[PDB]
């Protein structure tokens with residue numbers, strides 16, 4: 466499936482408005498200070514219909530395991546306890562998180578060999594560019 470092309474190890478090389486995105490979510494000053502400095506590595510694995518996404522950095526590490534279209538519980542890096550759903554739309558992996566009546570969407574797409582992660586919360590949009598190792 467289109468999800469197979471995402472498999473690999475990816476390193477952050479560019480970031481726009483991630484602090485705005487964290488501030489919109491309610492991430493505090495001290496975590497924002499450090500998180501703005503991180504250049505995470507994301508490792509994406511797929512085993513049959515189970516997809517694993519690890520995000521790793523010197524600050525915080527996260528891991529999620531999911532199947533497309535099946536809701537799962539997630540505890541985000543900023544300790545939101547969210548209900549999450551990931552689906553494929555064309556070539557885009559769309560990850561929607563919901564908590565406390567709020568919602569944010571993390572979209573992953575391959576563009577010219579790079580992984581573009583778009584983070585949307587309300588009107589705030591952050592774009593994170595990852596390069597394959």
Ligand SMILES: CCCCCCCCCCCCCCCC(=O)O
Nearest residue numbers: 500505520522525526527542543593
């Ligand atoms: C796990 C390393 C990420 C460092 C940031 C931790 C505090 C902010 C968390 C906000 C939501 C997570 C957004 C993911 C960003 C990404 O994968 O590049």
